Amino acid sequence: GFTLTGELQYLKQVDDILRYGVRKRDRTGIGTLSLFGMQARYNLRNEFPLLTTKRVFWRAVVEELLWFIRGSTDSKELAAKDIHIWDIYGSSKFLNRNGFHKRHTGDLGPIYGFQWRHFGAEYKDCQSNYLQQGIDQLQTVIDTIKTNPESRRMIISSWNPKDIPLMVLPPCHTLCQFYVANGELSCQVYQRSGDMGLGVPFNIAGYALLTYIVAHVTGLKTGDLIHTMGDAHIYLNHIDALKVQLARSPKPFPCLKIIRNVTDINDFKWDDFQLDGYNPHPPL
Amino acid sequence: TLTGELQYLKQVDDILRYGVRKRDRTGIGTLSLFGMQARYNLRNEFPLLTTKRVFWRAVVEELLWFIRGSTDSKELAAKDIHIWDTGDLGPIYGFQWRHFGAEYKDCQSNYLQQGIDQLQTVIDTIKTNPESRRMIISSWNPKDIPLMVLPPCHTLCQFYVANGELSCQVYQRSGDMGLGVPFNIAGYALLTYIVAHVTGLKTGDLIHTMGDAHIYLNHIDALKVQLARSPKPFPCLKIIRNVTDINDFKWDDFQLDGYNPHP
Ligand SMILES: O=c1[nH]c(=O)n([C@H]2C[C@H](O)[C@@H](COP(=O)(O)O)O2)cc1/C=C/Br
């Protein structure tokens, strides 16, 4: 291979946004450097693509995925586990200032988890029960992988325009596609908007984890994660930090082991995962 | 740092040299690679492949068929274009582009003001919030998919403005390099030209992303021939009339110059 992969390509990406990126006025008010249309390959064979040049909150990644898997959209459940990444959007101050004054605290609307397990259902609130409503994208993929893995139609999309106005924020990782070859599960994720500073390393971990999880329950080996994105951007108030992180040579990716033989997609716990060798670089 | 049609050709070559044995949905064998991407420049050129003649008139008429939200294949046959061959194809691209989330009945029923007009929405957003990262047209509707004759290959696309130029990245889940992909490239390259013209913007890049990029085992020889050929300079597409309405485009409004494909 003469083309970069893994954390080298990620760093290759932030570098290009730093030299060729375009300054644009962002929704949040603060400016960003932007490039459009990127793609990075992350090998999943015998290693886990958890970025090492700066520490990734691994436990939040795990809990958020299981939070997606159970169809949940109540940020309080994450905060009940000291995972406060969605707390801002669940907070009462945000909900009222953004037209969601009738919704109760934590109600994130029809976010990822809802679209994953019940796409098409009419959303009520994060407390409601929606079982056997909508379309279970996650479970149809698992069924298709077991029945007809040659399929090129194994996709999970969160982009529901009809439900989007109810969402606190449009799905950044809009969809992913699974792919099976040589009894080896692969997964490409399309990310419409990717903040290189915060979200992108967090998402890469999640969809790598998701591929590991699905490949687990389907008896398949993990192939590759392909991280495709649209508006690849770097917030201007992060440039100084990203250039310091840029000089760090990334360490060997860690191992991921599942200590239990989970057969049910909903039956995964935080205590099921073993991460060996994660020795990221010291903070700023 | 590989430009133009050579991007497509290297992709073809890679799936032949590095491609994986994977079975097609119909039973035939294919060579496959998961995850690819190509950047086609739209500045003073149009990425219509030259190493093989592409059905230019169906690219245009199908798009204008998508734009007016038609799911009737008889509408394309009425212009001697039968690439979709009574009539009712189910809630395909046209119904998803203009009426996403509406209740589909048949190809003759009316869906105006029903569902969500993604196409006009991204148009409005370009004139209003060109810095938006949410300008997306998705054709993937798990609800309506079992009623489609064929699931959408081009799942979605995202538009992007920078320095007055309009760029589009399209996600194609499944790419037959032998036939589909070339027709598809020009399909979304043409789309960018249309939305740019309406919005008054320039044309940036078509970013072409693929999932299962594959080659059928019949087409190997016929692609080994095409790869032997030398690429030729891309044509120049000119929108000859000043159209303001996305629905006001006709075949006569397009002038394709300098297209010299191989036999
Ligand atoms: O636009 C296209 N481009 C393409 O390559 N193809 C090709 C891609 C693939 O071989 C086949 C689609 O079958 P599945 O992937 O669903 O099993 O047709 C098809 C289309 C039309 C889609 Br409607």
Residue numbers in the entry:
A (entry chain B): 12 to 295
B (entry chain A): 14 to 98, 116 to 293
Question: What does the published report state?
Answer:
It catalyzes the transfer of the methylene group from cofactor 5,10-methylenetetrahydrofolate (mTHF) to substrate deoxyuridine monophosphate (dUMP). In this process, deoxythymidine monophosphate (dTMP) is produced de novo and mTHF is converted to dihydrofolate (DHF).
The active site of each monomer contains a molecule of BVDUP. A molecule of PEG 400, that is likely to be contributed by the crystallization buffer, is also found in the active site. The BVDUP phosphate group is coordinated by the conserved Arg 38, Arg 203 and Ser 204 from one monomer, and Arg 163’ and Arg 164’ from the other monomer. The 5-bromovinyl substituent on BVDUP stretches towards and binds the hydrophobic patch on the active site that is lined by amino acids Tyr 100, Ile 122, Tyr 123, Leu 180 and Pro 182. The O3’ of the pentose sugar in BVDUP is hydrogen-bonded to His 244 and Tyr 246 but that in dUMP only interacts with Tyr 246. However, rather than a catalytically active closed conformation, the BVDUP bound TSVZV structure is likely to represent a catalytically inhibited TSVZV.
